[PDB]
Structure 1
């Protein structure tokens, strides 16, 4: 799997209601998405 990494410092912004809650392979909570999601980074 490829990792998407923040290209800039800033504030992440997205509507987290569009995405399903999940537990990651590492036990971390995460969102699992099955759409094209646009994430803002307010740098």
Structure 2
């Protein structure tokens, strides 16, 4: 229901070791998190998690 959106333009950096491979209902490739993770958005000036 709730869709997390990107705060600003940049690169998404996260550690792929804690996330396990999956297949979305919509058929796209994806990653499932069973634990808390912190993604970083390398933007021009600031970051976001």
- Please indicate the TM-score interval, normalised by the length of the shorter structure: over 0.9
Partners of 1:5 and 1:24 in 2: CA distance = 17
Spell out structure 1 runs of 4+ moving beyond 3 A: none
Return 5+ residue gaps in structure 2 as ranges: 44-49
Q: CA deviation at 1:17?
A: 1.3
* Higher RCO (CA-CA < 8 Å; seq separation 6+): 1
Larger radius of gyration: 2
Question: Normalised by the size of structure 1, how large is the TM-score?
Answer: 0.92
Return 5+ residue gaps in structure 1 as ranges: none
Question: Normalised by the size of structure 2, how large is the TM-score?
Answer: 0.82
More helix per residue: 1
